[PDB]
Design a binder for this molecule. Structure first.
Ligand SMILES: NC(=O)c1ccc[n+]([C@@H]2O[C@H](COP(=O)([O-])OP(=O)(O)OC[C@H]3O[C@@H](n4cnc5c(N)ncnc54)[C@H](O)[C@@H]3O)[C@@H](O)[C@H]2O)c1
Ligand SMILES: NC(=O)c1ccc[n+]([C@@H]2O[C@H](COP(=O)([O-])OP(=O)(O)OC[C@H]3O[C@@H](n4cnc5c(N)ncnc54)[C@H](O)[C@@H]3O)[C@@H](O)[C@H]2O)c1
Lengths: 318, 318
């Protein structure tokens, strides 16, 4: 039994847990030829987001029986080619709730306190910028949350109680008591959340309903002084509409951690604007969260290699 | 009765409150000659931090009876020259507690989530930096707070309960129950706080005891992975020792909002380091906080012009 690690895990504990039971090779940022040679006899595959497992590589893997992503996203795996051969594709979701909550708070406060802008002014000797701009006090301001899931609830709870913000939440599949629990108000009309909020943070599941649900019409309804925070999925925002919204000052700025596509091109049009700050899809990649997903990825590989049904099968039809 | 506004107030409501009762002139970023001409017959003076009121300008003001700073700092007023002439110098402290608390949280999270560093990597097309660095999960980490005053307590309360951090506090003039109230542990040995903390935030009163109390010896005791946050006063940190500490990687980085001296020179040696982020003394200058200090400054000017003792006299001997 051999296992191939396409990319390091977010923590080396999952790799030692696999080395104790199988023969493991690790390849960091490989070319396609390195994948083709190292996957022939391999029995389990781990894929580090967002590198891609294609139908050719899956076709060359003769003994392959289980594939594990590093986290929730499977948009880089050819699941169809893997189902045809009956290969188990496994996920690792929901191990980074606390990491993304902290990251959303960091970016909300960064936009409000004008962190990156004020930093360059002082480094460039423009201390006198404190006569033209001012930071935003969060207390009393309205935070609008799309998606009152695990992460959206946690962000709502902190901003309402610790930051004394007014929290509105939009989620068609949630009882209003869930909003009441975290001291938020559930709002059905998304226009109301858009027109009321000084800060809009996205935490919904990526579905056909939420795919590109934040487009130019939504940005137009938002306050020109409002900010957008996106730590969910890149496909929730129609990227060109976010460019127009920023360029035409339809919103005051944004902070995004997820992209479409991933990885983003080096010439992304959003990089130009200073009121838009980025992080390379790391809101859920803290050491504590990376250690959980790495262990979870190691278990599910071993469980399939031993004929046990792992908890997060993407294609249960095999 | 005329009043001179050396610099705009942090909000124009205090200026209208003075315009209703006196003749007001406002000068923005003046030369010394503009001050000399506009202060001769003036009866009240407002000074916007950190511009300086010198003994010459005070000497030329014949009808001057009250001086008000914009906030707490009076290190830019020649209080001695004003006391000689019996002029009331007035302060405006403690109106920005919530503003600085939010600002400290923003900077703590910014250092932990590596905000500014990860932002330039993505803008420079280095999305793959997520393979070399990782953000820090605050949960379980130790926050060390120097000065359990109004702001230090508020920061401690949020980081302990909302962020699930371990909070240690150093303050010789505070009962341990005050730390227990905000779910922190009061620590007498400052070495213990230095050696234990992953994040050190400064909120003490600037005294002879706290003047330059954070020097090279203190940085050496700190963890090389720890971060420094300074929203108190610039004189609490011995600036050259912070340069050596950063350059020699004695600490992982810093986030400072206050300087010594203020304003800082355009060629400050700290501007060079990327793990050091700045804001131009704005932690207490939110609109809500700026509106309070502006009203407070307007009242104390009018109260002296009407023979009423204002609450924040710097030189009560007049
Ligand atoms: N940036 C990262 O590294 C990272 C890490 C983990 C998760 N995420 C993403 O964060 C997002 C939120 O995470 P989660 O664990 O809390 O998801 P979740 O499953 O706990 O809940 C998401 C919520 O979305 C809601 N929702 C569904 N459709 C909606 C719609 N049309 N409008 C409004 N709300 C809708 C659902 O009711 C659900 O409550 C997910 O998209 C997840 O992929 C990102
Ligand atoms: N950046 C800004 O714009 C801004 C705005 C307001 C206040 N501040 C500064 O923030 C700092 C804290 O504000 P505050 O209102 O909470 O002050 P505070 O008066 O409420 O309390 C400060 C604490 O310092 C403690 N202290 C005194 N000596 C100490 C020592 N040797 N060691 C440890 N602790 C000691 C005191 O016991 C007191 O509890 C002050 O220096 C203030 O000037 C900055």
């Amino acid at each position: 039994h051999k296992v191939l690690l396409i990319g390091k895990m977010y923590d080396e504990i999952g790799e030692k847990l696999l080395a104790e039971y199988t023969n493991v090779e690790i390849i960091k940022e490989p070319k396609q030829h390195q994948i083709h040679e190292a996957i022939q006899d391999v029995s389990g595959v781990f894929v580090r987001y967002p590198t891609k497992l294609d139908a050719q590589a899956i076709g060359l893997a003769k003994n392959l029986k289980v594939i594990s992503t590093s986290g929730f996203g499977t948009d880089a795996i050819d699941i169809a080619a893997a189902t045809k051969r009956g290969i188990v594709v496994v996920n690792n979701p929901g191990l980074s709730t606390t990491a993304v909550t902290e990251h959303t708070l960091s970016m909300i406060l960064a936009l409000a306190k004008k962190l990156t802008f004020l930093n360059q002014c002082v480094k460039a000797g423009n201390y006198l910028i404190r006569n033209q701009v001012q930071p935003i006090q969060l207390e009393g301001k309205t935070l609008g949350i799309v998606g009152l899931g695990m992460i959206g609830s946690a962000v709502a709870k902190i901003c309402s109680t610790a930051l004394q913000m007014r929290v509105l939440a939009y989620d068609p599949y949630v009882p209003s008591g869930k909003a009441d629990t975290v001291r938020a108000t559930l709002v059905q009309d998304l226009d109301y959340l858009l027109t009321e909020s000084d800060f809009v943070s996205l935490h919904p599941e990526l579905t056909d309903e939420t795919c590109e649900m934040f487009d130019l019409e939504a940005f137009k309804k938002m306050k020109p002084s409002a900010f957008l925070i996106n730590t969910s999925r890149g496909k929730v925002v129609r990227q060109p509409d976010l460019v127009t919204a920023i360029r035409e000052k339809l919103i005051a700025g944004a902070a995004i951690d997820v992209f479409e596509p991933e990885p983003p091109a080096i010439n992304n049009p959003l990089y130009e604007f200073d009121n838009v700050i980025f992080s390379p899809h790391l809101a859920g990649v803290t050491p504590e969260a990376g250690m959980a997903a790495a262990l979870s990825a190691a278990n599910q590989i071993l469980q399939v290699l031993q004929g046990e049904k792992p908890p997060y099968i993407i294609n249960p039809k095999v």
